[PDB]
Amino acid sequence: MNIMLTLLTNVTLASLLVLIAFWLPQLNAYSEKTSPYECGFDPMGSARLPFSMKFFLVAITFLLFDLEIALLLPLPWASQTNNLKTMLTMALFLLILLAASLAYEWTQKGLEWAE
Amino acid sequence: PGIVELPTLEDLKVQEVKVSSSVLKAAAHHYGAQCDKPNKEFMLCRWEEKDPRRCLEEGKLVNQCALDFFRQIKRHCAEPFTEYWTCIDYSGLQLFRHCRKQQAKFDECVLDKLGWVRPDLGELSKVTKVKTDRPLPENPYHSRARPEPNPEAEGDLKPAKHGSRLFFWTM
Amino acid sequence: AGRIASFLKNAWAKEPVLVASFAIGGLAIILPSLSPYTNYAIRINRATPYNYPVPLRDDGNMPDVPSHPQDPQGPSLEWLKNL
Amino acid sequence: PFFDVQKRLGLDLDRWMTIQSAEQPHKIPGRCHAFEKEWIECAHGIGGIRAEKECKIEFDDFVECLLRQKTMKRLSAIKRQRDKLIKEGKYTPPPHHLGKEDPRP
Amino acid sequence: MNPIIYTTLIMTVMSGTMLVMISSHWLLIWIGFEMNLLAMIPVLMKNFNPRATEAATKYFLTQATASMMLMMAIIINLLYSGQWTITKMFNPVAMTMMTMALAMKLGLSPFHFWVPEVTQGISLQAGLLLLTWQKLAPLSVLCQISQSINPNLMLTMAMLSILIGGWGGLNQTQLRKIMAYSSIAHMGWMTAVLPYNTTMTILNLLIYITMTLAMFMLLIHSSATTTLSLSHTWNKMPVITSLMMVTLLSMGGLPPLSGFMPKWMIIQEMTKNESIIMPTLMAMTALLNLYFYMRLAYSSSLTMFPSTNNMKMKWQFEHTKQMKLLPTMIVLSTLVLPMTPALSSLN
Amino acid sequence: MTMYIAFILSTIFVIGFVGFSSKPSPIYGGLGLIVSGGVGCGIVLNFGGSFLGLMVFLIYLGGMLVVFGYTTAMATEMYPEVWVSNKTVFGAFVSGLMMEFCMVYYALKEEEVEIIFKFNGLGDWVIYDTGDSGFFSEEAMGIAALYSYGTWLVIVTGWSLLIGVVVIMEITRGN
Amino acid sequence: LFQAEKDRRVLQMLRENLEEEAIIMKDVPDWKVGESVFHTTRWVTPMMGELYGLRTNEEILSATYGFIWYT
Amino acid sequence: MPLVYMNIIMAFAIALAGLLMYRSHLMSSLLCLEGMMLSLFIMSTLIILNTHFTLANMMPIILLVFAACEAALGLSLLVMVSNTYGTDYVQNLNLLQC
Amino acid sequence: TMMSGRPGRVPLQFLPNEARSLPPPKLTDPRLVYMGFLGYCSGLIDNAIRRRPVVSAGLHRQLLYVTSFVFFGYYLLKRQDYMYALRDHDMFAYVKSHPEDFPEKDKKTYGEILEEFHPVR
């Protein structure tokens, strides 16, 4: 309830700021002023053309490493279990495999960007 | 299928313990030390019947014993207890840690006036025995009669008559 | 045992971060099995009363079950107060 | 097809999680624990074919606890009749159903 | 690919299948399927080319959609009964969703389209794996829940699979597509008897796997992927072509060969029920599979096609690495009909 | 029928699914799925699953960042399509919207079966539990039990993650 | 003490609902007042739709989203 | 059954149809797959939250983990397809026609 | 299906303890001889595929083929016989325990039954 009111207040304040910024000043837009910005001249191609991604392999690994966070965040609560020896074995197992996966991608030159 | 039987309102009338949660938390340790027997009888009733309708008298006894406990506190010293529960009421988590002096004064009063000893750590959490005349319920789950199982596999194994008996095979 | 010294020397000269990481991870793996305080941690976890202790029906054959919380029977937490 | 390695070795690889009445942490019970245990007990050992017809009552109670179709329909019927009667104007609900009651601890 | 990584991937595929077979929990069976797919995708792409990438992509999309449907069926079954155990499948809508999910994992018609394309786009080793080992887990799950299976839907899909496999196989010149269509028809034969007797399903599965292993191993021994490349084999390995012809006859289902036994048992089991029309249609449709098997046998063993001059150089070299169990698979794929009553050790 | 908050959140969930279901460019499909993830987080917050909602929101935010990178790299065109820039996309969008509105109307007005069985509505507050117990939270204890009860799940999941890293390496190797 | 008070409060709300629906539904010809929807006769915990069903929307929301929204 | 369950199931059906229908870019199909994961997660969480089953609170976590595994697999395949053809168009994946 | 679930059955036994109360198949059983023939055929096909003298190339490996097939066949036959014995045992017990479903009908002689006659002409 209060978080909804807070979010609404923040979004409304930002929107009113945009509205003020767009309706208070004197607008004079003509074709040359709104043209795309290159440093001095006109662009050759488009900004919508494909832009090659040299770290594409690290990005996919980020998805798999991100989900290893969902497995480790309940660890503060798991420390309150009675049988700590099986919990600590499983928590360390979950991090050794995460370390071994990082080591594997490192040694196979997976962490290097495409040249 | 069937009518749910509910108690009448006059069966649900008792004198209420109308002190706030801070007063209750300030009193909790001594209250558990003194009012243990009715509370344990009520909770044994509660986990043995699995029905709020079958343990109303035990709950009324719980209320009565708690009211007498608070009456004793009110009769012998109310000032140190008021200070203690004012502490407890101020903090948002009702932490015991935030005044041990007022708790000390309350403990001294209840010890040198009523002879009450505050329970130590690990005592109120013990599982205790309770002696009741209430008969153990025969079937609290209201279970039906379980269906009769398949009888058994009895006898000695003998070779199949004329073997497999599949089409032309003779074994 | 002689070449491993030179291997560790080279690693410490070139990759101190990896050496530190492996030493810390190995210590974290092995030390808990050699500690006498992990049993204390387990028993502390076991002594936290999250749930209500349901009383037992008295049948007359329970010499080790208390009749009252302040009775001498039952578990003791004096080891925790001094810990 | 199904190789029951767990039953052979007594392992419990995944049986701990199959039913609501099986050893939850901190003894937290399911919403329909009693219905499920009644159905399982009645159902146990008679086989699947016999169980559907014979224990149909326990399973029906368990499903009613899980999804609460009958209770919702009964409550909706009572509410609709009450709405019709107050639109007709001959019911005048008591103060304790309009937030004007005396609460109890 | 590194041999260690390849072995790890193959063992991960096998461990996913075993996890599907040994699990009593629906979530664990789903995890087994997902692990199987995850390790299976690279194996199809072991030899890299655009066709292998296409096959991997199509297989991934089909299996991912099937996994979606399977998880949705599991969740609906949980909603209508708080049960996680693989059993009678208390809800019928969830049961229909599960049946279509598993059928599309298997390749049963009308979901059969992915199989010919994926088999053609990969090598013969990956095709062997796909057409033999990847059928065990869905069939195991289908066997476990055959009591709640709907006869009208399953039998419709089985008859459709038999018809479509028979018809599509007639048009094919490539060997991998022929094997895929025969796989679809055999899948239909397996799933037709599933609501009646799962022992017959397992028997047909074992016989089909033996014949398929023999046929792929023969096609790998003689490195042939088309009809005319196999037409050359008689000039280098006549014994291989003769064994292939006998294996093809067995695949067709003509007695006294091993292939005849599974259909014979399925027909008997269906006629123990009323079920008279459908086995008749199934046999008359398996005639098509026999026809294109015979076309292959004509092109490869019963006639001698023209050869090339460079075969004289191949005449001087031996087959370097010999696959083990090829002799055993051929014998089990042809001369096992007299041991038919031994199917009682399957229930 | 009490402030309709769960209803509104679920309706926005379906609207976002229709938005990205239309396939009116990856950049806007990612926006739609982000909105759906946020409103789903809210939906499961309203039922007491705060940890699960927050975590799924976080996971999908990361995934959508990766998808945005990949869309600018390999799934872009000269004129990316928005929901009103193409007849097929707009038609699918409005069809999904009208289907959602139609099923909502035929559910609120009448209790008639759509696919599985007819529902009631009545506000999803009716089916709650009255549960007065616990100084902990049930969801957090259940999730934390992944290390004490779910050893087998941890083993299979960790193996799958390591295998997935190896698999992406092998697939994108190339050659 | 809290357990006893909760039992009494729930039972009183259920009795009030019983009397109220007995008055409301007595016009209906074949309505069994107080009929259970379960075959079993053991006690079944209420659903909050059976307790706060006849009450105001403020109380319904305080019972449903009261603790969740209190931050 | 509540009405929020209708909304979640309709979301799943919409995502399934969106996946089934293919336009041009492969990326959009992977978006539909991930949406189907999102809907399955929400449905599982709601059912699991409603009936107090404590031990199944972890299965949505595993569901998300294997969802990420599928997403990574699809992204790797899309990388390779785009490298082969320069676009992620499904029209190019037609070599196995013949 | 039918035999998958039965009371008192060990999952992966392949040969329960109650199977030892059955007569073992003779070593000269014709099915065992056929299994040995299958082993011999496998050995001959192995010789022919590898381009070796089919009848005489490897005697030790052919012997291993034959004995392996016989060895597997013996236990296969034991399990086959055990399962058929279980089938007959269960069927007889079910017939005995349900008399009203399997009643012994009255014995009629062909002098009393009236069969219609169809001439051939």
Ligand SMILES: CCCCCCCCCCCCCCCCCC(=O)OC[C@H](COP(=O)([O-])OCC(O)COP(=O)([O-])OC[C@@H](COC(=O)CCCCCCCCCCCCCCCCC)OC(=O)CCCCCCCCCCCCCCCCC)OC(=O)CCCCCCCCCCCCCCCCC
């Ligand atoms: C029911 C009753 C029993 C019947 C059971 C079934 C039949 C018997 C078992 C079948 C399996 C056994 C053998 C299979 C492997 C053999 C392969 C082979 O090529 O053999 C070559 C080999 C001769 O080669 P070699 O001496 O090394 O040097 C010449 C070069 O190798 C020459 O090499 P190459 O490169 O010049 O060869 C080229 C040739 C090579 O092509 C072939 O040879 C065809 C291979 C046969 C296919 C087998 C597939 C699996 C078996 C299925 C049988 C189906 C039966 C059901 C009815 C349907 C018929 C298909 O290919 C062609 O020229 C194209 C011709 C296309 C014709 C298409 C028809 C072929 C399929 C017909 C199969 C029917 C069964 C034949 C059985 C015997 C065949 C050798 O033949 C033999 O010497 C073995 C014959 C049997 C030996 C038994 C002798 C034991 C001791 C005798 C005494 C008995 C007991 C003593 C005690 C008594 C007290 C005193």
Ligand SMILES: CCCCCCCCCCCCCCCCC[C@@H](O)O[C@H](CO[C@H](O)CCCCCCCCCCCCCCC)COP(=O)(O)OCC[N+](C)(C)C
């Ligand atoms: C930061 C968060 C808190 C903010 C709290 C205060 C909120 C401030 C409200 C936001 C607007 C402030 C902008 C300041 C100047 C107003 C600009 C605009 O809104 O007014 C006119 C908008 O009016 C329309 O243009 C023409 C008016 C005809 C329509 C009638 C108004 C609709 C209501 C019906 C009549 C009632 C009149 C008021 C009596 C109640 C100008 O429009 P336009 O010329 O394009 O743009 C040029 C603006 N310049 C000149 C300043 C550069």
Ligand SMILES: CCCCCCCCCCCCCCCCC[C@@H](O)O[C@H](CO[C@H](O)CCCCCCCCCCCCCCC)COP(=O)(O)OCC[N+](C)(C)C
């Ligand atoms: C028998 C032949 C096996 C051959 C196949 C091997 C392949 C699988 C690998 C090993 C089998 C895993 C079985 C483990 C099942 C877990 C259950 C059992 O082991 O007990 C657990 C014992 O815990 C141990 O930690 C088991 C795990 C130790 C093994 C570490 C993982 C290494 C496995 C290798 C595969 C992983 C892939 C990556 C390689 C590093 C928990 O005991 P406990 O806590 O009292 O009881 C909990 C129930 N409570 C709540 C009522 C108390």
Ligand SMILES: CCCCCCCCCCCCCCCCC[C@@H](O)O[C@H](CO[C@H](O)CCCCCCCCCCCCCCC)COP(=O)(O)OCC[N+](C)(C)C
């Ligand atoms: C052409 C024929 C193809 C044959 C295929 C390969 C032949 C060799 C088979 C390999 C033998 C080892 C397998 C198992 C040995 C020990 C393991 C033991 O535990 O298995 C038990 C029993 O062993 C196997 O189940 C039976 C294997 C017997 C295979 C031979 C039968 C072939 C069919 C008839 C064709 C004639 C073949 C003649 C020989 C070539 C399992 O019991 P259960 O857990 O309860 O079964 C669960 C699944 N069920 C109930 C649905 C069946």
Ligand SMILES: CCCCCCCC/C=C\CCCCCCCC(=O)O[C@H](COC(=O)CCCCCCC/C=C/CCCCCCCC)COP(=O)(O)OCCN
């Ligand atoms: C038993 C503990 C297990 C868990 C603890 C570890 C947790 C986290 C640590 C592991 C994370 C991943 C490991 C990454 C492996 C990297 C392998 C590699 O190839 O790195 C080498 C660099 O490192 C090496 O040379 C190989 C290993 C070097 C040392 C690594 C550790 C060796 C052992 C150290 C400690 C031994 C045991 C503890 C005793 C300490 C002494 C007191 C290549 O360098 P680049 O950056 O690619 O080159 C770019 C610059 N031109």
